[PDB]
Design a protein around this ligand. Structure first.
Ligand SMILES: Cn1cnc2c(ccn2CC(=O)Nc2ccncc2Cl)c1=O
Ligand SMILES: Cn1cnc2c(ccn2CC(=O)Nc2ccncc2Cl)c1=O
Ligand SMILES: [Cl-]
Ligand SMILES: [Cl-]
Lengths: 127, 127
């Protein structure tokens, strides 16, 4: 048996994987859900959503909901805030601005993305 | 518009995503293919396979093959070598040993994982 700890580490592999998953999203390859946010909608991979959000983890882990192909978010959720967070999921880069911080933060609370909410709080503290 | 370059970077996000995808694999959650390697078989997420391997990218990008639920690898492929590479895909950690290097290298050639083949060559050069 081989403990992963003594194995050879590839320091860019995880980031390469995420970039390639984002490339598949951009080509709509093997996306399996549409997220509807008021008048807008965004396709994604459920696995990535689950990996990044407590809300999506809790939805899709439940066998009752695992096969859903459409999720309607709460009508109060800002589509721009959601789009910023979806991009973050697939890139590790978060577009916070003075003009979007409150919407992004509220959306991250709803999506149960605790480290992102904490970063939003730090953005507030620094402005 | 916001260039990703000026956005806030989350330095552990990609690795967290990959760990969570591996956790889903371990629970067989949203896996959509079985890879058959002689007498053994391994379930996976096609998106991760595509992200990590030229062979799987070329198979699943083609609309002819995208919906396949079973892929039979070449009968000469060593299941242990394949298992090591599948683990690598989902962990960024490669278990090379003197006893497995040749099988892993040959399997990585077949899977079209060029950086892994290069690392196998370096392992050979160092022994
Ligand atoms: C509060 N909260 C809740 N869940 C979160 C985050 C950030 C990401 N996730 C998703 C997650 O942990 N997924 C996951 C866990 C275990 N096995 C498989 C998977 Cl896909 C957060 O801040
Ligand atoms: C030779 N070769 C060929 N392909 C490889 C590697 C290592 C990973 N991949 C998969 C890959 O690039 N996937 C991909 C590309 C573009 N858009 C989406 C995806 Cl999913 C390699 O060494
Ligand atoms: Cl598709
Ligand atoms: Cl499932």
């Amino acid at each position: 048996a081989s403990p992963a700890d003594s194995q050879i580490q590839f320091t860019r592999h995880a980031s390469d994987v995420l970039l390639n998953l984002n490339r598949l999203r951009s080509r709509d390859i093997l996306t399996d859900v549409v997220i509807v946010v008021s008048r807008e909608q965004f396709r994604a991979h459920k696995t990535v959503l689950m990996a990044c959000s407590g809300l999506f983890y809790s939805i899709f882990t439940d066998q009752l909901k695992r096969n859903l192909s459409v999720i309607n978010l709460d009508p109060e959720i800002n589509p721009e805030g959601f789009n910023i967070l979806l991009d973050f999921m697939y890139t590790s880069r978060l577009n916070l601005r003075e003009g979007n911080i409150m919407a992004v933060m509220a959306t991250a609370m709803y999506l149960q993305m605790e480290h992102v909410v904490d970063t939003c709080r730090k953005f507030i503290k620094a402005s």
